């Protein structure tokens, strides 16, 4: 179970990154639906709660729009790129840790 | 110290988009005789600021 927890920290980080990526993809796909509210989650607090069933928050709008659509484009695109990069970083960290654990048994 | 680049560039993109929106609004309402209440339309423009928590991205203060 020690191995379980030691890899569990990074596994949960990766899982939350995947969930945030899914939400970003959803609000990209629905970017032109009138009456839509941009949704996002707070990664740090969510990870803390999971380590110690996911709630999502409404993104603060930046400009008004008559059709009731508040999901911006540039901010969420930068968020998408950042989330993808951090997901890849978590993936490679987990892979390095697993390979280091494995090669000891050789 | 390399993940702040995304924040800086995103702030710059948002500020430029806001400036473009303001310019488009001015061009559209170049010949607006009146608004809803009755007061004549007045040209608007943004006011940038340095988004330093030291230098960082640009940030729009108000209009």
């Amino acid at each position: 179970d020690r191995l379980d927890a030691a890899l569990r920290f990074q596994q949960e980080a990766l899982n939350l990154r995947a969930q945030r990526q899914e939400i970003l993809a959803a609000n990209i796909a629905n970017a032109d639906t009138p009456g839509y509210q941009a949704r996002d989650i707070d990664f740090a607090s969510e990870l803390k709660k999971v380590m110690v069933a996911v709630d999502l928050l409404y993104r603060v709008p930046d400009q008004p729009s008559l059709d009731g659509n508040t999901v911006d484009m540039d901010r969420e695109r930068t968020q998408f790129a950042d989330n993808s990069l951090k997901y890849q970083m978590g993936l490679t960290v987990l892979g390095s840790q697993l390979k280091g654990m494995m090669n000891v048994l050789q | 110290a390399l993940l702040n680049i995304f924040d800086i560039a995103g702030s710059a993109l948002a500020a430029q988009s806001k400036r473009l929106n303001v310019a488009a609004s001015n061009l559209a309402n170049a010949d607006s005789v009146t608004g809803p209440d009755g007061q004549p339309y007045r040209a608007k423009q943004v006011v940038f600021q340095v988004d330093a928590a030291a230098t960082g991205g640009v940030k729009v203060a108000s209009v």
Binding site: Q37, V60, D62, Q63, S65, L66, D72 | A14
Partner: peptide, 21 residues
């Protein structure tokens, strides 16, 4: 608060009145 941040309750509806009553 600052645009692009996160907040607990949604934005109010946006309206474009042609003439104020």
């Amino acid at each position: 608060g600052v645009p692009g941040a996160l907040s607990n309750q949604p934005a109010p509806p946006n309206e474009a009145p042609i003439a104020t009553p």
